[PDB]
Unconditional design. Structure first.
Lengths: 272, 186, 186, 272
């Protein structure tokens, strides 16, 4: 019924010139991302990467990282996000435990001269039942397997329920080692929306400034992040671009709902 | 010690004009109206005066989402030579914090923003800047009237945090913003 | 990368205007025409924009002998509050030497001269001067158009030896001239 | 048929508010000059000044001097102009030789508080055949007597021949000890014109500047003065206010006529 990369591949056809992901002054359209990830995927295949394999990807906050994640899935493998801020001992444990074949960094596309590969659609490899990624948690770290189908069902249920479309902008706050980021990336790219990436998730004043400056419409984090963000905002601040606040967690600080609706009046607050 | 006739004249684009600050945030500015309000600096020969045929005032505009038929939101550089609008930035957007104090709600209801930048090249050697400030008032007054030929409201903004507007437009060190204008009303 | 409509608009007081430099030195400006061209800054509420409702641009005019029905030659201070013209000097007169270089024959054929002076009082603290330069361009553009409602030719003068014009008008130390205009044509 | 002051008195009625004489920023209308000279005339009468007397007047380049000259004539006496730049020995010789009763200076009106006298018309005293002034010459100095009638005939012949009227402005270049100045003063005031006085007759650059700045229409001097004035003028200078150049003398430098008509094209050059 669905894989994560096919969902995006289909949307690249519908809207080739829509901006898919912006970091700062860098950006990729839907066809640039599709083209370059096809090429990296072919490069990975020349390295024996295919079905059943696991590929480590350093979770740098760069648009090229999105290229790499998509390429791993197009080559038929599952990606294991590696936090670039973790100590080397923790990174090593996760790479061994998940039986990763290689580790991918950003700048891969340029310094291996991968523009020289064909940028056309690949032969399908991954099936809905195959693993799409492995998330490690509670850092002792336990890796959880997630299939293409389970992830697709989640992101599409959300896209349909709240009518995410081309006019939407998602702010990429959470680490791509965290499960919430799978919606930030593939939910955005399945609906034709734009992902706006963030350099530092701890710079609260820049998080709320990015919401105004780049017209963010969708906020998808744990409750704690939104709470800390609203401490670095003016008393009479009010933003009308944010229409959807997705909060995942059971523990919400008591005045936060009232706070969200004072500084984000258009925002619909969802506690899933 | 003389007195003058207060008896005459038919001011239509000069008296029917006034600093507007409330706009219909629902009706889009028809692609015709917009493309004509911008006809004024069409372009060498222009429709307004300029010290020494220099015309150094480069004009930019910001467009809010879906409030001007036929124009995606973003920052544009209008070209006189072509009567054209090239996109320069469609990811960023001006925010209330770029304005200040009394000007928060003006920009709120606004549909688009017009920016007048002094292209600091030539002939006068630091008096061309003085001549540019007058030219910005010349340009402002023509637009405000032509906006009365079409029921487009206008309001001048004296000061504003051009600190980052400067970069979203990709201005040089020889380009300095002088004036800004917020521009349908009811 | 966008294109705009070059198809529309009806510019009448904006395109039919242009820097005029040849005048009929024989026909006087009818007391009506003159008193209406000067209606523009009638006056608080005016017919043009001004930063912060300050309107600091004081306007003066020089009139050549017998070239404006109903006005003796001399230097006058127009009053907005009254729509009036008080004589300030009728013995002295501006001469070709007050202008320079290319502007000798412009003043020659001219009928009258309009002077825009920045009354340097208040609120902005040395930014009101910047706002005044824009207001002079605002005023200039309204006049040039209203002068097209009446076939009065106009031409801006950037620089000019205001050294003694300064005294014939009895300007203060807080009054600084910014712009001058020479104003029927054929 | 005519006296010099009656000619002016009649014109004061026709045009009371016309400017009669301007120096720098000082000026008098036709009625101010008539009023104040009536008062000074009464003050002179209280000092025994009347018919047959001679009154010395220092020829200061001030509007008050005009007041004094007119007052002497209204009191019925003749005035003897005294050059303020002459040595005291020459001034004394002229005052004795002409049997002057008193010597008048400017500031007389203020410091004797003469505004306290009646400013209305006086009873006529002087007759056309009475002496109006005494001009001394060839400075040894010989005083020449001139009657009211001889002076009136001269100034009126000129006013009529060249149609001098209210629109005209006379530049007062020549000393009021010189005969040419009688036209500058009384010819101007007989026709309703304006006299523009000059501080220093030797400042050539200011003479030609006054012609432009104050719209001089009539120039009445000896040929030498106009010649020296045109040495301090630009190559492409051209003035259109000057319509009449009165030159009195037999000796005209050869290129001067051609020079006058290059820098004063509207000017009619008269060699009387
Ligand atoms: C150069 C200039 C700058 C101005 N800046 C501002 C501004 O920052 N904020 C504002 O509210 N109005 C501004 N105005 C408008 C005047 O404050 C005010 O509207 C004035 O009354 C002109 O409009 P009126 O025709 O209604 O008077 C500006 C006007 C001018 C000419
Ligand atoms: C601020 C300003 C100062 C000007 N100064 C002069 C000047 O000193 N001499 C002159 O001949 N024209 C002057 N102009 C007019 C322009 O040089 C020229 O006429 C320009 O082309 C505007 O008229 P246009 O509509 O014919 O182009 C000035 C114009 C402006 C706006």
């Amino acid at each position: 019924a669905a894989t994560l990369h096919q969902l995006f591949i289909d949307q690249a056809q519908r809207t080739p010139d829509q901006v898919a992901v912006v970091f700062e002054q860098e950006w990729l359209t839907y066809s640039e991302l599709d083209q370059r990830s096809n090429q990296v995927a072919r490069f990975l295949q020349s390295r024996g990467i295919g079905r059943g394999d696991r590929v480590g990807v350093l979770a740098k906050r760069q648009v090229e990282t999105i290229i790499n994640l998509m390429a791993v899935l197009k080559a038929g493998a599952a990606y294991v996000p590696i936090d670039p801020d973790h100590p080397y001992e923790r990174q090593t444990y996760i790479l061994e435990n998940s039986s990763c074949k290689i580790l991918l960094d950003s700048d891969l596309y340029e310094t291996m001269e991968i523009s020289s590969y064909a940028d056309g659609d690949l032969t399908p490899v991954a099936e809905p039942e195959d693993t799409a990624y492995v998330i490690y948690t509670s850092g002792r770290p336990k890796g959880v397997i997630i299939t293409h189908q389970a992830a697709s069902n989640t992101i599409q249920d959300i896209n349909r329920k709240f009518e995410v479309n081309e006019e939407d902008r998602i702010i990429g706050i959470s680490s791509m080692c965290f499960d919430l980021s799978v919606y930030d990336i593939f939910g955005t790219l399945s609906a034709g929306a734009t992902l706006v990436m963030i350099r530092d998730p701890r710079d609260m004043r820049e998080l709320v400034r990015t919401v105004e400056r780049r017209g963010i419409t969708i906020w998808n984090t744990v409750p704690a992040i939104m709470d800390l963000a609203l401490d670095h905002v003016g008393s009479h601040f009010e933003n009308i671009s944010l229409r959807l606040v997705l909060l995942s967690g059971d523990w919400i600080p008591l005045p936060l709902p009232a706070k969200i609706n004072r500084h984000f009046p258009v925002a619909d607050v969802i506690s899933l | 010690k003389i007195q003058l006739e207060t008896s005459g004249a038919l001011p239509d684009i000069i008296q029917k004009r006034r600093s507007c600050r409330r706009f219909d945030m629902k009706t889009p500015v028809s692609f015709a109206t917009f493309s004509n309000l911008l006809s004024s600096l069409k372009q060498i020969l222009y429709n307004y005066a300029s010290a020494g045929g220099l015309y150094p005032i480069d004009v930019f505009v910001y467009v809010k989402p879906r409030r001007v038929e036929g124009v995606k939101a973003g920052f544009y550089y209008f070209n006189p030579a072509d009567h054209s609008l090239v996109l320069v930035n469609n990811i960023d957007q001006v925010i209330k914090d770029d304005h200040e104090l009394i000007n928060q709600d003006i920009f709120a209801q606004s549909a688009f923003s017009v920016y007048l930048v002094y292209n600091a090249r030539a002939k006068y050697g630091a008096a061309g800047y003085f001549y540019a400030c007058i030219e910005a008032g010349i340009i402002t007054a023509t637009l405000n009237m032509v906006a009365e030929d079409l029921n487009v409201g206008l309001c001048s903004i004296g000061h504003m945090n051009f600190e980052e507007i400067q970069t979203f437009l990709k201005l040089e060190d020889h380009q300095v913003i002088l004036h800004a204008i917020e521009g349908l009303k009811i």
